[PDB]
Design a protein around this ligand. Structure first.
Ligand SMILES: *[C@@H]1O[C@H](CO)[C@@H](O)[C@H](O)[C@H]1NC(C)=O
Lengths: 49, 49
């Protein structure tokens, strides 16, 4: 859904449609998300600080 | 192996003309595709002749 905002999500309504179903058959109790960082010429290129 | 939420045909898994041996009890080989089941489990391992 396109929007022009930073924070404090709008009050508009939008449903969610499924895309694909995954039949694992195994319970899940924990989850974690992944992010991608950039290594430009400004940073030294080491993933320490 | 566990298979769920998939529609597959065994005909191509039989017309390879390369399997040395074949065995299947309980259901006729020519009428198991129509007979619908819930889940199919594959037990893959190696063994001597
Ligand atoms: C939940 O996962 C654990 C770890 O595999 C398993 O021992 C347990 O039987 C599972 N519970 C159910 C209801 O499937």
């Amino acid at each position: 859904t396109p929007i022009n905002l930073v924070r404090d999500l709008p009050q508009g309504f939008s449903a969610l449609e499924p895309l694909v179903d995954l039949p694992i058959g195994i319970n899940i109790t924990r989850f974690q998300t992944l992010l991608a960082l950039h290594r430009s010429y400004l940073t030294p290129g080491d993933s320490s600080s | 192996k566990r298979i769920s939420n998939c529609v597959a045909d065994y005909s191509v898994l039989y017309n390879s003309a390369s399997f040395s041996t074949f065995k299947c009890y309980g259901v006729s080989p020519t009428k198991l595709n129509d007979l619908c089941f819930t889940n199919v489990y594959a037990d893959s391992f190696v063994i001597r002749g």
